[PDB]
């Protein structure tokens, strides 16, 4: 919460994980350095720059997508807003 942007929020959430996580470092590298081209869905230049494989890059991407993008939505407050219709159309005995 109270994060400046998405990269800061993801780094904050990733800094609470223990070092025993299998793919923590790769996800941290991707989030810190190359996030714009991850949003661009490159998945190929990301391989070149990060020097990873498909079976590892996919795991890092899944770990990133397992994070929470909006921390402040845990406490949801509000109400949906409705309208009063002006005319009603229904089905009576086989017609409208």
């Amino acid at each position: 919460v109270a994060a400046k942007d998405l990269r800061d929020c993801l780094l904050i959430q990733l800094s609470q994980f223990d070092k025993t996580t299998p793919w923590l470092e790769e996800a941290r590298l991707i989030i810190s350095d190359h996030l714009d081209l991850l949003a661009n869905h490159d998945f190929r230049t990301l391989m070149r720059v990060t020097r990873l494989k498909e079976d590892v890059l996919k795991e890092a991407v899944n770990l990133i997508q397992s994070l929470d993008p909006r921390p402040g939505q845990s406490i949801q407050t509000g109400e949906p807003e409705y309208v009063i219709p002006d005319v009603l159309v229904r089905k009576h005995n086989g017609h409208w």
């Binding site: 949906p80 807003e81 409705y82 309208v83």
Partner: protein, 49 residues
Amino acid sequence: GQNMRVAFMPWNGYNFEDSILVSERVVQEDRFTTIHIQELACVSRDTKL
């Protein structure tokens, strides 16, 4: 109700002023176990969006 074997006597102050002393076998045999059923509702409405 249920048929209970009962004795009328004071027992160490545990039936003081209308208190009741119950055996553990009564609980083990589920003689006064009851089922309670509760209903919960979820309503899906139509909004502007």
